[PDB]
């Protein structure tokens, strides 16, 4: 009993113990590869099957192609919609740093949250998801820096 065309967009916990987080948008579930390892997901009766995935990008989509295409403008502050295990979803504003690789530059957020937070969305001021949190490095002082990992639409 739903209106034709209705979805339920939003942010979801990937549970097993929370192993990760994901974004539901336009009927596709977006999370990071290392969270599900391409395994199928349950959505209460419905089963989500993987559609696209890349280990190197550490991304995977379920039920359809990757839909998120907004990008950080390299200039403005962003918000991590952090969904840590056992805690309510919460918005953290920050100015991203920069990962510099031999193949270009990527935004990166210096925010530290448990491993089960991987797949939490990063937002621009429009509320558009500009990437997923949870693939980065631990620097010398023990703190964690995550790339703003975005896919291709």
């Amino acid at each position: 009993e739903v209106k034709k065309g209705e979805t339920t967009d939003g942010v979801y916990r990937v549970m097993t113990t929370q192993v990760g987080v994901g974004v539901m948008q336009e009927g596709v579930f977006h999370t990071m590869w290392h969270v599900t390892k391409g395994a199928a997901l349950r959505s209460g009766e419905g089963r989500l099957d993987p559609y696209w995935g890349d280990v190197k990008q550490d991304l995977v989509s379920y039920c359809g192609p990757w839909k998120l295409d907004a990008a950080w403008d390299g200039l403005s502050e962003v918000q991590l919609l952090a969904v840590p295990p056992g805690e309510r979803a919460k918005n953290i504003q920050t100015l991203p740093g920069i990962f510099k690789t031999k193949d270009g530059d990527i935004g990166a957020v210096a925010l530290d949250y448990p491993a089960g937070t991987s797949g939490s969305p990063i937002l621009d001021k429009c509320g558009r998801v500009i990437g997923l949190y949870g693939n980065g490095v631990v620097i010398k002082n023990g703190s964690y820096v995550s790339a703003i990992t975005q896919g291709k639409r």
Binding site: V11, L41, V55, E77, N91, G97, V137
Partner: protein, 40 residues
């Protein structure tokens, strides 16, 4: 096996806490999708 449960709406929150620095790091991405810091 894994399952998903809703956690909230995806919205920008006005007057959210601001924190964290913006470091510029030279990193390398291997074929396994792992980032590592580049030695000086």
């Amino acid at each position: 096996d894994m399952y998903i449960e809703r956690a909230g709406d995806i919205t920008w929150e006005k007057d959210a806490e601001v924190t964290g620095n913006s470091p510029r790091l030279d990193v390398a991405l291997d074929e396994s999708g792992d980032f590592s810091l580049v030695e000086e």
